[PDB]
Design a protein around this nucleic acid. Structure first.
Lengths: 100, 113, 150, 98, 127
RNA sequence: ACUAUGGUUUUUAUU
RNA sequence: CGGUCCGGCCGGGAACUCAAAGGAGACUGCCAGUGAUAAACUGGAGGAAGGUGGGGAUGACGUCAAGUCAUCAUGGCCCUUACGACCAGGGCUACACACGUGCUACAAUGGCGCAUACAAAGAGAAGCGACCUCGCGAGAGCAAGCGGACCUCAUAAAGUGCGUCGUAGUCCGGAUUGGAGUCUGCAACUCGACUCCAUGAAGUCGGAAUCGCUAGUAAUCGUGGAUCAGAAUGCCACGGUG
């Protein structure tokens, strides 16, 4: 990962709280074709693409101890090489190779 | 016999010579069997003149018989310019939809020597 | 006496008149789909009795009496040498092999599949004619051209 | 109207927390529903273990939870309060609904 | 007297009662051939029953739930032998002689890690 | 002492 | 065992299962024989099970001119007005030829039509979305049920029963070919998934050879899940047949 990525990280999420996370239940209901003569929303759909570098498809969940979008387990926030230690240090509830 | 089916097997099932012909397949074959109200199981009903040939009107809203390709065989001539992606791909045997040519193209390229 | 014999494994049928049944319906059987290999019992011989002569009481009994393997020839160790020897076909196999060996014409005769194939290959086998019989006498003479030690 | 659930990440910890509320259930009503055992939930994971490829080297884990319903069986402010000094046990989760 | 036997096989569980009396067989309050007639294991429950002769002097009552027919039939066959060995303890010596008092050598084991069904051999062609 | 049965181990390089 | 024109349904009860947990029984222990009355091999009683009971955890010394600067560390080499780093558009399915591993099949150990039995494991906070309806249809509208052993995703298929095919590149098979849609995303020319009605060519069991199993084993049928805006036939779990 680029060293700029940890500065991009906090810029992306702040733009998503300003816009995307406050518009998602509105964007799903402007799909209307009932208004009489001309469209009422056609000129405002472009708000989905208005900010730069910030979008839900760029803003993937990512690993939370390594700088990777890929090779992760969401229920931990970790990759296999950190799960092999965390399953031996838990902390993480119920995580064991049986034996109770 | 052969009142609507153009082939000599006249003692067989209601798909034989009554599907994939002159703009008719299973769905539109059912639609004229439905127009005449007849029976179709194991064999098609034995029928005479003036019973279903009079009802070809009830399935007429498609490209059929002498009209199956007639007007599109002139409309498809509209784009022919070599700078036009659709014009060039009509003027040569090419897919206007686009396909891959490197790997798994051997139907379109035909047999290899 | 507890652990003795142990008996059964398979049982004799009162209507079929042959104990080969449990290995005869094991032929052309795939992914455990037995009923698509058992499709020749009271069907193919009912058709043979309508394609060659009359009755079916001895047709499958006499066809496997006419096509009968008795010897097989292999390269076998005496140590370190591996001489060719004739060996007799083992008693539990002796009448159970030939019924599985009629395959080198099956995709060529155009007999319209399964029960209708069987209704044609048996009328050749009941004279020791047709498929694989030239190869049977070729093994019989492969064991005549050399008889080894017995 | 109210609903209660008690979940734990250890088959002895589910008893340690249930023991507060099955005895609270004896300080109310007249009949008790015991623990109400419910089916256990098992969450599993199959993972790789080699530093690089080796498809013959694979590993697995499991996280199982034990769930008890108990039922509070009568409207009493003292019996729902028994859950307010209970969720703080390491590996426990209390869920109150309605 | 009511001689009782339990039997279980691959997620199915059965209960059998044997009594002296009239030669009848009942299963899930239906006749033995009331809903079975094409299933490939429907006859294996008869194997221990001819050892004392069938349907002339002994009363059978069976209940079963869970699993599939080959499981239910194998569970019922061993439930029958567990009840029949209480009816006469000298039949133990005869049920061993046919293999009917032992749990058979096929049972469900835990999923071997990854690799699809984890029993097949993967690609090892030399190309 | 008897599967009837396969030629022979490149010029030769120099982390 | 009560209520029972007689249902796990309501009361009750956990016999029998299931979810599970804490824990057993088997020691070569007992016998015959071979063999060297040792070991071990082959048989047998008792037992649910024994002489690897079925299945699975493994890297002793040593070895390979083995992989990895990419888990992680970091010398050196090279660029350092740049091969560093920011910024916008582009490339990663750009095409020529030979495949390694897969897959629908080549027809009847199969199709076409029609009815029909027997499931586990998971997912569900603008979710999973029923019943119903519009649209040829993808999909969408209207809104219950349940926040989920209960509702919803959710009509298991192979198999089974009755008709049919007359063995032929075919009623087979379906690359194509045309006109228009449905869904998603700045993005679908190039380079996505899905659909309706027409429309149409190969494929005839594979050359030398190469690979899988000693039994729930080679083979084969159906359902979920993760990553995730749209997109897997690969990955991970689960059940059916033999």
């Amino acid at each position: 990962a680029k060293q700029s990525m940890k500065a991009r990280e906090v810029k992306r999420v702040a733009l998503a709280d300003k816009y995307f996370a406050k518009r998602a239940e509105l964007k799903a209901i402007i799909s209307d074709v009932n208004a009489s003569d001309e469209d009422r929303w056609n000129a405002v759909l472009k708000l989905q693409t208005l900010p730069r570098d910030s979008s839900p498809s760029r803003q993937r969940n990512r690993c939370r101890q390594t700088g990777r979008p890929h090779g992760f387990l969401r229920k931990f926030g970790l990759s296999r090489i950190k799960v092999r230690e965390a399953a031996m240090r838990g902390e993480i509830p119920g995580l064991k190779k049986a034996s109770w | 016999a052969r009142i609507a089916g153009i082939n000599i097997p006249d003692h067989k099932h209601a798909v034989i010579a009554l599907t994939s012909i002159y703009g008719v397949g299973k769905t539109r074959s059912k639609a004229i069997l439905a127009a005449a109200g007849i029976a179709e199981d194991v064999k098609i009903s034995e029928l005479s003149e003036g019973q279903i040939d009079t009802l070809r009107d009830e399935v007429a809203k498609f490209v059929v018989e002498g009209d199956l390709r007639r007007e599109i065989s002139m409309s498809i001539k509209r784009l022919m310019d070599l700078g036009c992606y659709r014009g060039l791909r009509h003027r040569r045997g090419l897919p206007v939809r686009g396909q891959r040519t490197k790997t798994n193209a051997r139907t379109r390229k035909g047999p290899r020597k | 006496r507890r652990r003795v014999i142990g008996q059964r494994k398979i049982l004799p049928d009162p209507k079929f008149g042959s104990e080969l049944l449990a290995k005869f319906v094991n032929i052309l059987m795939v992914d455990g789909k037995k009923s698509t290999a058992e499709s020749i019992v009271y069907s193919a011989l009912e058709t043979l009795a309508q394609r060659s002569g009359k009755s079916e009481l001895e047709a499958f009994e006499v066809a496997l009496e006419n096509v009968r393997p008795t010897v097989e020839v292999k390269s076998r160790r005496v140590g370190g040498s591996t001489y060719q020897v004739p060996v007799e076909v083992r008693p539990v196999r002796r009448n159970a092999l030939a019924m599985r060996w009629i395959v080198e014409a099956a995709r060529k005769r155009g007999d319209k599949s399964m029960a209708l194939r069987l209704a044609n290959e048996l009328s050749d086998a009941a004279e020791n004619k047709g498929t694989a019989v030239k190869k049977r006498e070729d093994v019989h003479r492969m064991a005549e051209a050399n008889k080894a030690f017995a | 109207r109210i609903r209660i659930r008690l979940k734990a990440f250890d088959h002895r910890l589910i008893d340690q927390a249930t023991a507060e509320i099955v005895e609270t259930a004896k300080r109310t009503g007249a009949q008790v529903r015991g623990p109400i055992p419910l089916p256990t939930r098992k969450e599993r994971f199959t993972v790789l273990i080699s530093p690089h490829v080796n498809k013959d080297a694979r590993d697995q884990y499991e996280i199982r939870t034990h769930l008890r319903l108990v039922d509070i069986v009568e409207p009493t402010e003292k019996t729902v309060d028994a859950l307010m000094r209970l969720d703080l046990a390491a590996g426990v989760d209390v869920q109150i609904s309605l | 007297n009511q001689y009782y036997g339990t039997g279980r096989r691959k997620s199915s569980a059965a209960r059998v009662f044997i009594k002296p009396g009239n030669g009848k067989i009942v299963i899930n309050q239906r006749s033995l051939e009331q809903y079975f007639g094409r299933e490939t294991a429907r006859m294996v429950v008869r194997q221990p029953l001819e050892l004392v002769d069938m349907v002339e002097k002994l009363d059978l009552y069976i209940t079963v739930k869970g699993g599939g027919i080959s499981g239910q039939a194998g569970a019922i066959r061993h439930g029958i032998t567990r009840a029949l060995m209480e009816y006469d303890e000298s039949l133990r010596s005869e049920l061993r002689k046919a293999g009917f008092v032992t749990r058979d050598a096929r049972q469900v084991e835990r999923k071997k890690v990854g690799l699809r069904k984890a029993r097949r051999r993967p690609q090892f062609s030399k190309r």
